């Protein structure tokens, strides 16, 4: 409503998708990626490090709680798990963050490829 107006669309681009995904943090450092397959450990029930359901780079699970632990209550608004990558809010921010497999090889997109038109 008002805030939005009209939707352009173009070929996306790494270096451009390199503008979102990564979220440098005042650990002073640089967070975006993922690297290693994962859901949570079995025994505990929460993602891991990288981890496809990350509780750090991705955010919370139990709402306002650093994977480092020692994190309860909420009101904080910048927390960065001192010693972990937990930056809590509501467990909502988690839904609004992406990462990337970072293809070692320059793979091409099937959506041009055998594409009915096959633009490429």
């Amino acid at each position: 409503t008002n805030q939005f107006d009209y939707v352009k669309i173009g070929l996306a681009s790494p270096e451009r998708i390199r503008q979102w995904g990564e979220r440098t943090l005042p650990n002073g450092q640089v967070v975006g990626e993922v690297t290693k397959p994962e859901t949570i450990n079995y025994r505990t029930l929460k993602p891991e490090m990288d981890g496809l359901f990350c509780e750090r780079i991705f955010g919370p699970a139990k709402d306002w709680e650093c994977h480092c632990g020692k994190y309860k209550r909420v009101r904080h608004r910048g927390i960065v798990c001192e010693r972990c990558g937990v930056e809590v809010t509501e467990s909502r921010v988690r839904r609004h963050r992406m990462g990337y497999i970072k293809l070692a090889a320059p793979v091409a997109h099937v959506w041009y490829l055998k594409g009915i038109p096959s633009y490429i």
Partner: protein, 124 residues
């Protein structure tokens, strides 16, 4: 790469914790990517590297189990609904998940004959 909470891993107690069908794409895809690089260095023969690059470009399946390799198999050799298979059919989210959401607040009961009441008004 889509956020996790939405492809989410699901809960049924007992050990049958369903998880999802694109994180496994990933599961692939990340491994095919890392294990590879993890060749590079040792720079061993391309028979295990250049041959994997295809098993790397194979990420195309992530984007579509289905265009152009044979599809990969699911619990029932299904075209593991690709991330590009969520908002695609009339039954694929998209319109039905917006143009035609189901929605709340209303009734759904058998409409038996009941001509006693008038027309401009119905009988709840």
């Amino acid at each position: 790469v889509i956020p996790p909470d939405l492809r989410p891993m699901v809960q049924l107690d007992g050990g049958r914790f369903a998880t999802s069908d694109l994180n496994d794409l990933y599961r692939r895809v990340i491994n095919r990517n890392n294990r590879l690089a993890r060749l590079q260095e040792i720079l061993a023969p391309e028979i295990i590297v250049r041959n994997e690059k295809r098993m790397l470009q194979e990420v195309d399946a992530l984007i579509d189990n289905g265009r152009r390799g044979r599809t990969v198999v699911g619990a029932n050799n299904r075209p593991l609904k690709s991330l590009s298979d969520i908002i695609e059919g009339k039954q694929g989210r998209f319109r039905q998940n917006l143009l035609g959401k189901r929605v709340d607040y209303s009734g759904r009961s058998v409409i038996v004959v009941g001509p006693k009441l008038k027309i401009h008004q119905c009988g709840l």
